[PDB]
């Protein structure tokens, strides 16, 4: 669990490190510019040594080649001494250059990370969704089709939706069954309850009155706000729970008054 | 606009300016561009220092106006400019302003042949402040104080 | 992969969760590697030892495995809810054993003789009586979907009623982590289904960006622009869930002002990293500056997406109408990105139709004599379009930018210029259109001709005007009120006075002084000069000048100090025209 | 006027909270009895039409409403001023 590699990070535009008497937008400019200058200044100081060391490496190598040529040859009685003094002085120089280079790399290993030195890009792909375009259909068939596609599949689920008449289980169906939030689901409760009126089934008419006024609330709300009914929320049910709550005391008569 | 402040209030502004300057130096930021038109007042006289703002010469140190070396910026350079700002706060009037010739300023400041006129300072200026102004604009960088010293002096001076 | 007979003790790789309300237990089962007797003693018996890392060390030359459990302290979190823990396990190379402890300083190991497990491990928690919450169907679903929905094996939940006597719901882990795939393999249907699953939106994303980054800091990410602004996007009472940060596909953190700026908070998405310095708790990240470096790479990419989206005129219109409020807030706050954010702006203009133009489109239509960009601010396009301030500007055929929502008064403070050209308000003192010497001569004849009328109108109105002067901007109106060059414009004052929680003690400082401009070419004004010349102290001139001033003030956008004085003047003039013979 | 002035305006939501304006007559007021008489005496009378609209624009200001376009209102004023002075 060694996390030390992460310890030294510099973020130019860091908002948590500020002072009340310095203008924030100018403080980011000075810290930004400063890290840039350091990276250029340090790179100049490094490249100066690369220039320097290459020269001494070549000078020592060539004088050593010449040393090999002269030490076996006439005048070698002095030119061995000269070209050895060159090989050795230039070799001393090489060592000095290496020390400067190794101090520079140990200084680089001591510098903090920043947004340029931590990473590089990999994948990059952008897509824009052109596909959805406007379409029309004959609603007489859509109605019958939505009855087959949903109502015949969800009429048994009427007992899964709200049965207590002042706060309800399954209220999260604004997520779980969002595609059914429509006028056809309200028409469903008027088409399908006809057997309940004929058979005087008051308790089912009373519990489904709660589901009915909720459908009328969300669809009327969506009409009234010019919004998609699917964009309603259980916060909106909580908002009609505030102050004076409900008008369903009249809908307890609708079940007879609508016959 | 030449509006006026009470001596206490002038000190409060100088104090906040120093308090900001010290924070910059602590972060190893040399402000360099220090001008009284680069310091701004806000509600409650909150001081905001920034790069947001003749003056091409006036606030710079004798070595910097000379371009005596390659951008010889240091904390003391900022101190010099600070001292100049203190001088104008403590006079209501720009330094050297019995003269205005451009080359004469480069000559007389650069070669050490005039201080700002500390005889122009407010009669209500604490002697300690008169010294602080004089100290902050001492000619040699090695002779002038750093912000920690300046600020310490200001708080002691104000109390 | 290298010994294929290893799976002959059971072929399938899966996870099962099995609550038991009747017996007050929660069981977790897997078909993974399992443990030998030596591994039960060493790995469950030793605090801060991890079998997982030892395993990872034995792998060579970059194996395609990236495991989660580095620290060797998490197993004991079982005792947060349990009174007693039993682990039953079987490796391929060993018998079946039980491990048991109640964390009382010791543990037991026993050879098991119950129903066999083919391979792997069964963890059994005997829950505390005040922790029975985790036996309930609803909390198990919430917890698994909150923390573990991207783990990459099927997680199945078993319950004794649904009709079925054991529902076995795999749907706890139904969605795949799409960002792990190569994006060239991924179609818009796949991004679409994921994004619905990430956000619970019923409609597709407008645009999506998939990207990755490499080096010391490694991550992959998905960013989505929604087709609609969320109904409550800007509410300051709601904690945002918008970006989630995962490490090795497990959920770390949320609620993040650190990962993305507040002006970009409508973007939904996922960031998933292979390696970060996590806290012991796994709830947070140790070096918090990392989040800031992740942010600086997100913002660049977000801006690029917007820019590319600006090439599709159709889709950029949908985007901009949902989120234009966002970009202008970015101009105000982001001192670094202001310059790109400005190229994303569009406005209605006077030379344009009902279609919007960019500032670079204003600049390309500029005349060679224009040195600035002209604009007007106000409460609606109709109110600024017929405005008195734009009469000579439009007469001379300059283009004028129309800015007509309250947030425009904020971003224009900070956007001083575009493409080196400055913005100039037609509402301020000291406007100029390009000069023509003939006109200059006429203005010098005019300021001489009207000089003492301006003096009288600065004697009458003295309390409440800085100067009276000839207009260089009026046509077809007798006057306008304009503000000083520093301090608030007429519109800025209206906005400020309505800020419910703002301290108004500073209004005396930030309100600008009023300037009055007269049109000298106009009938009422020239007849007012003649009458004022006829007698300077005629109270009728003092009356007429005040009635003109209030009318101008109102049409210029300033509230009247008391509207009843004003209405009463009107009701008196109405009587005079309406033929009331009773003057009383 | 507070709601129209907020920076983070959410203007999609805005249209639905505009209240309906109702106009109340003072039946004792001498302008409106003169109007009651001109309304009986000639119904096609454009003078009434102009009076009723100028009263309405003036009534908006009294009650704290802004004008939909302040220029049309000021023009009605600059016409009365020109007639009063005898300019045209
Ligand atoms: N079902 C299992 N099958 C095999 N090994 C397991 C199983 N469950 C736990 N382990 C062993 O228990 C060890 C300790 O796990 P524990 O969760 O306590 O710590 P860890 O996984 O090593 O670290 P971390 O706290 O990050 O998860 C594991 O490293 C592994 O060897
Ligand atoms: K362990
Ligand atoms: Mg573990």
Residue numbers in the entry:
A (entry chain C): 2 to 260
B (entry chain D): 436 to 488, 506 to 611
C (entry chain B): 60 to 221, 273 to 694
D (entry chain A): 604 to 691
What does the paper say about this structure?
Here, to further understand the molecular mechanisms by which PP5 is activated and selects its target substrates, we determine the atomic resolution cryo-EM structure of a human Hsp90:Cdc37:CRaf:PP5 complex and biochemically explore PP5-dependent dephosphorylation of both CRaf and Cdc37. A complete atomic model constructed using the consensus and composite maps clearly revealed a PP5 conformation quite distinct from that found in the autoinhibited crystal structure. Surprisingly, the PP5 catalytic domain was not located near the readily dephosphorylated CRafpS338 but was instead located on the opposite side of the Hsp90 dimer, with the PP5 active site facing the CRaf C-lobe. Further focused classification of the CRaf:PP5 interface revealed a class with continuous density extending from the last well resolved helical residue in the CRaf C-terminus (CRaf616) to within 8 Å of the PP5 active site. The PP5 catalytic domain approaches the CRaf C-lobe, where the CRafpS621 phosphosite can be dephosphorylated by PP5.
The Hsp90 molecular chaperone collaborates with the phosphorylated Cdc37 cochaperone for the folding and activation of its many client kinases. The cochaperone phosphatase PP5 dephosphorylates CRaf and Cdc37 in an Hsp90-dependent manner. Importantly, for RAF proto-oncogene serine/threonine-protein kinase (CRaf or RAF-1), a member of the Raf family, the Hsp90 cochaperone, Serine/threonine-protein phosphatase 5 (PP5) has been directly implicated in its dephosphorylation and inactivation.
